[PDB]
Design an enzyme around this catalytic site. Structure first.
Site, mmCIF file in Angstrom:
data_model
loop_
_atom_site.group_PDB
_atom_site.id
_atom_site.type_symbol
_atom_site.label_atom_id
_atom_site.label_comp_id
_atom_site.label_asym_id
_atom_site.label_seq_id
_atom_site.Cartn_x
_atom_site.Cartn_y
_atom_site.Cartn_z
ATOM 1 C CG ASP A 150 -3.393 3.907 -2.192
ATOM 2 O OD1 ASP A 150 -2.556 3.002 -1.927
ATOM 3 O OD2 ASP A 150 -4.473 4.061 -1.562
ATOM 4 C CG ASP A 155 -1.889 1.157 1.230
ATOM 5 O OD1 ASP A 155 -1.471 2.278 1.605
ATOM 6 O OD2 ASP A 155 -3.080 0.921 0.962
#
Ligand SMILES: N#Cc1ccc(COC(=O)[C@H]2C[C@]3(CN2)C(=O)Nc2ccccc23)cc1Br
Ligand SMILES: [Zn+2]
EC number: 3.4.23.46
Length: 394
Positions: free
Chosen positions: A224, A34
């Site tokens: 992201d 992430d």
């Protein structure tokens, strides 16, 4: 970097994870990659959606920091106990690191049923670590305790009773030339908190949305890996969907399709890719007044789902959705491209991924330069709260 190729797995739409070990003796866990967060945190007690969890008391090298942590996302949150321990990445660099770990003790809407991951590796900057920025993020510790160059790169590769398996590569400490073709173009990191960037223009099938470019980056634009969709601010999403609706208008889909909440289907192999437009985001270049474009296909933003009850059919979810916290270049974007997180030079590189899904007429593309004179400022400045203003940073 061959030992790091193909070191990510997951299920379509549920996150890419890498295998890590924590503790002595090593406990193996599958950890979400992430780039939208900066904490290393692992499920540390039983939970309906976890096969396994970190057992601190079973590691002779664990140290409790005697401090709690709480991270609430827009969707999902968790809390935990802070400590450190020895951490390695078996299909990563040949090193062991003592890193901060949050042992997650409670959570809500965080873990995902069927995803096969049990924790999260936050690869963004200390500025958004919790509880504050003095909690050294994992990559910072890795670079600091080892010789590993301050850079990583991500190749995320796209896709009846289970969702599609996906694979990918996270190359820690450099760039693997087998993983892309053609030119590698970089955009400045606006600020080291998120991997924040600036979009200066958006085109749908070559047609400019003609928005104030500040609208593209309201209230920020970030890359992201841990977000599935291309997510766009309200006004941008509405114009973008209007344009895509228009181009695709020979097919009349239900509202729920466009809200990302319903599949649409064609007979196996007969999907009319060519009625869906390409989307080009122009990113700020390293040189003033330059930009380059990354162009994605409907193969990226139309995400395949094999339906039990129409398994004859090719069925797709729309994976562009609305945001109230800015543009998120998620997996949908990233699956076009080999994305280089060049922390050392405060920039992000994009090249065409040698694994992106395309057809015989169109490919994902990274192209530049493009030039504007008196190119205005497309960045937004987030209003500063008294809370945030009051924090000291020693
Ligand atoms: N305090 C704070 C704070 C607030 C928002 C963010 C934004 O974090 C992201 O976007 C990460 C986390 C993510 C996807 N990427 C998500 O949003 N829900 C969720 C659920 C499961 C896995 C990953 C995720 C970061 C911080 Br730190
Ligand atoms: Zn002070």
């Amino acid at each position: 970097f061959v030992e790091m190729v193909d070191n990510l797995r997951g299920k379509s739409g549920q996150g890419y994870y890498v295998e890590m070990t924590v503790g002595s003796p090593p406990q193996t866990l599958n950890i979400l990659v992430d780039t939208g967060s900066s904490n290393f945190a692992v499920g540390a007690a039983p939970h309906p959606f976890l096969h396994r969890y970190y057992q601190r008391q079973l590691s002779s090298t664990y140290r409790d920091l005697r401090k709690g942590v709480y991270v609430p996302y827009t969707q999902g949150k968790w809390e935990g106990e802070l400590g450190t321990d020895l951490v390695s990445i078996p299909h990563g660099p040949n090193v062991t690191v003592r890193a901060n770990i949050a042992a997650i003790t409670e959570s809500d809407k965080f873990f995902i049923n069927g995803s096969n991951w049990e924790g999260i590796l936050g690869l963004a900057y200390a500025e958004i670590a919790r509880p504050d920025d003095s909690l050294e993020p994992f990559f910072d510790s890795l670079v600091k305790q080892t010789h590993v160059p301050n850079l990583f790169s991500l190749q995320l590769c796209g896709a009846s009773e289970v969702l599609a398996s996906v694979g990918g590569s996270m190359i820690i400490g450099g760039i693997d030339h087998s993983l892309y073709t053609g030119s590698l173009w970089y955009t400045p990191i606006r600020r080291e908190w998120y991997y924040e960037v600036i979009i200066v223009r958006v085109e749908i099938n070559g047609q400019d949305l003609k928005m104030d470019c500040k609208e593209y980056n309201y209230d920020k634009s970030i890359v992201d890996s841990g977000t599935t969709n291309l997510r766009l601010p309200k006004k941008v999403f509405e114009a973008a969907v209007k344009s895509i609706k228009a181009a695709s208008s020979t097919e009349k889909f239900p509202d729920g399709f466009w809200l990302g909440e319903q599949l649409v289907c064609w007979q196996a192999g007969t999907t009319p890719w060519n009625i869906f437009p390409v989307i080009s985001l122009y990113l700020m270049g390293e040189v003033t007044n330059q930009s380059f474009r990354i162009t994605i296909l409907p193969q990226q933003y139309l995400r395949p789902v094999e339906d039990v009850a129409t398994s004859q059919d090719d069925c797709y979810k729309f994976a562009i959705s609305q945001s109230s916290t800015g543009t998120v270049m998620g997996a949908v974007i990233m699956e076009g491209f080999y994305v280089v997180f060049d922390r050392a030079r405060k920039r992000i590189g994009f090249a065409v991924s040698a694994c992106h899904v395309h057809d015989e007429f169109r490919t994902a593309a990274v192209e530049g330069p493009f030039v504007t004179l008196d190119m205005e400022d497309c960045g937004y400045n987030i209003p500063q709260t008294d809370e945030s203003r009051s924090h000291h940073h020693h």
